[PDB]
């Protein structure tokens, strides 16, 4: 079972949410073959995909579109999802009422499944989801000394055992809602645990196409968080998920010969070097970005699914 009924109301005006959506070389209301790219924590849309999937999806025939929820995905994850839901509705109608793919990284995958869980209207508008290193269960790795100064709202909510991650799980959000592919690695230095190749991993979704790099490439295969998005292996897996008639990556489309953790071969030399510096804005955000001293309160639609957890207002019930 999943949440049903009308979409919850947005807490932000539509002009604010519309302001966060951009398409490369096209208007959101008139776009050909759009793809929604959702960035990770501590970054904007261009910062996550300029070096990788904005050019890679454009070469595959898509119009790169993205959201950049302020500030740098560090604010309340529930509010970042409003940008995605509004963008999908806009891009669905903007492309002649046709389904569009969604490709994410880091918190972006958590944002995608959160929207599909609690905003039922977009379930018939997303044809597939290609999530790179998503943290559906949050992460057990604390911030690089983010325990005496607090952390960003989105960092609170991405901690294992948070009210947000609890509510997503309890609402049935750990089962895929659209055809979903999850590409992750046991060597992820930001999102853990990922070492079980099982529902214990943070990126695992039941009935999804869960691709742990070590399961395909070997137990000693190393590929970090940024590589999980930009690698040639990730391109092969992602390109398979986008081309597939089932909506999921196909095991026949990739193999041990594609196990390259370096940036995708099709990227230009400037793009590969830029892809290696993917987390540079993320590093700045965790050390010098906004911080608060409690996990943001749950919105009314998600509050009933995390009874017992403490947020800024107190205990849910």
Author numbering: 0 to 316
Paper text:
Here, we choose lipase B from Candida antarctica (CALB), as the model enzyme, in which Asp187-His224-Ser105 is the catalytically active triad. Lipases function according to the classical Ser-His-Asp catalytic triad mechanism. In the present study we propose that the Ser → Cys conversion in lipases may lead to high activity by accurate manipulation of the local environment surrounding the hybrid Cys-His-Asp triad, enabled by laboratory evolution.
In order to gain insight into the basis of increased activities of QW4 and QW10, the crystal structures of both enzymes were solved and refined to 1.85 and 1.88 Å resolution, respectively. The raised mobility of loop 137–150 in QW4 and QW10 enables ready entry of bulky substrates, which can be attributed to the introduction of the V149G mutation. For QW10 and QW4, S105 and C105 remain in close proximity to the substrate carbonyl group, favorable for nucleophilic attack to occur. Extra space is created by the induced open conformation of the QW4 and QW10 variants compared with WT and QW2, which may also account for the high activities of the best mutants. The calculated reaction barrier is 10.56 kcal/mol and the reaction is exothermic, the energy of the tetrahedral product being 25.75 kcal/mol lower than that of the reactants.
